[PDB]
């Protein structure tokens, strides 16, 4: 749980194919365009990132919770098995997701790494209400 990242990035080898890292400019890692830029996230806002085809669910939830800025404790949950977070949260059963990867062995190890890439947590903040605070 010692959330590495060394191990965390190694594994990213398991998101890379759906997912890009890139920055407002160049690309750390290199990954399929299926899924969004995974860079930033941590600090972000569920589904913000523009010009992608977000699954309708994350979309409505981002909505019910104009709040949610992907901590990385959310990252841990989500990726673990995302429907059960997405869903649960809208309460609307029949999540859907566009993400089907289920990752159940090394969670924090990863959020760790992705916490890092999105360097802004700003030392601290911008809000609070649990789950959010970004
Ligand atoms: C553990 C490796 C990966 C992690 C850590 C991960 C993380 C995430 C996160 C945090 C989101 C929500 C972002 C937002 O709110 O915008 C997301 C959305 C998504 N992911 Fe992944 N992901 C992983 C692997 C993959 C893979 C392998 C695929 C393709 C096979 C994929 C497809 C998607 C899609 C389509 C969405 C959009 C969901 C929607 O709009 O409703 N992901 N992912």
UniProtKB/Swiss-Prot annotation:
Q: From what superkingdom does this record's organism come?
A: Bacteria
**Chain sites annotated for binding heme c:** 15, 18-19, 99
Q: Name one GO molecular function term.
A: electron transfer activity
How would you describe the post-translational modification of this protein? Binds 1 heme c group covalently per subunit.
Q: Does the keyword Endoplasmic reticulum apply?
A: no
Q: Does the keyword Translocase apply?
A: no
Per UniProt, the keywords (alphabetical) are: Electron transport, Heme, Iron, Metal-binding, Pyrrolidone carboxylic acid, Signal, Transport
The name on file for this protein is: Cytochrome c-550
Included range, full protein: 23 to 142 of 155
